Amino acid sequence: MASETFEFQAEITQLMSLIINTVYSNKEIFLRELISNASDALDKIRYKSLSDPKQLETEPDLFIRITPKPEQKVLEIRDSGIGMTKAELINNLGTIGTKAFMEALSAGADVSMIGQFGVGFYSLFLVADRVQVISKSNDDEQYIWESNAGGSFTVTLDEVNERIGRGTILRLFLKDDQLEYLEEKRIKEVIKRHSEFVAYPIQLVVTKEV
Numbered sequence: 132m133a134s135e136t137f138e139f140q141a142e143i144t145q146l147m148s149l150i151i152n153t154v155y156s157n158k159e160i161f162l163r164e165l166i167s168n169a170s171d172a173l174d175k176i177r178y179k180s181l182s183d184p185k186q187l188e189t190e191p192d193l194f195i196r197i198t199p200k201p202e203q204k205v206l207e208i209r210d211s212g213i214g215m216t217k218a219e220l221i222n223n224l225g226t227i228g229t230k231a232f233m234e235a236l237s238a239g240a241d242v243s244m245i246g247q248f249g250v251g252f253y254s255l256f257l258v259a260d261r262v263q264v265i266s267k268s269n270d271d272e273q274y275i276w277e278s279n280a281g282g283s284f285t286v287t288l289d290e291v292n293e294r295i296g297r298g299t300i301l302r303l304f305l306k307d308d309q310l311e312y313l314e315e316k317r318i319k320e321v322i323k324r325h326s327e328f329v330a331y332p333i334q335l336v337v338t339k340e341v
């Protein structure tokens with residue numbers, strides 16, 4: 132399609148570079164962050180569906196799903212949440228207080244606190260050097276947001292990915308040194324830690340050779 136290129140907010144780019152380059156160790160935190168946004172995005176659709184039940188028909192199942200793809204060194208975190216339009220993709224992930232968090236870090240804050248600054252999405256750059264956010268809102272076509280921690284991101288109408296009913300997929304392209312997060316044991320372990328009080332089911336997609 133006709134990919135559109137956009138510029139990142141000065142701060143957001145800073146945060147990303149800070150993270151993608153950090154020598155931090157507890158990198159497994161990205162998972163609780165992403166699952167956190169996933170769960171939030173799932174709340175918003177279930178809330179909206181209270182007055183507008185027909186909103187749940189595009190995908191009557193509320194779930195969070197992690198799918199490892201070893202060949203492509205990719206880890207997808209999917210949720211059947213409310214999804215984002217072309218514009219929402221552009222605002223949410225490239226506009227909207229990331230400055231406060233960076234200040235906290237410069238004071239000695241815990242990277243794992245990023246979530247309390249409402250910017251945990253960018254924690255994905257701890258384990259991935261490239262991300263593809265594929266989203267589908269009831270109010271728009273399926274789109275593909277894409278960033279590489281660089282200063283600019285792209286937005287392209289989705290015509291290459293599976294049709295998700297309604298929701299969002301974070302297609303993380305893991306770094307070579309972080310390929311451990313493709314393994315069922317490693318993934319299962321991390322999720323069973325910081326993710327205990329989630330209302331929605333968390334499905335893990337495994338490929339078992341018969």
Ligand SMILES: O=C1CCC/C=C\CCOC(=O)c2c(O)cc(O)c(Cl)c2C1
Pocket residue numbers: 165168169171172173175210212213214215223252266298299301
């Ligand atoms: O802004 C957000 C999360 C905050 C929740 C606000 C509105 C719900 C829609 O937001 C989303 O689609 C969403 C998602 O499903 C998974 C994610 O990992 C991220 Cl980062 C987002 C974008």
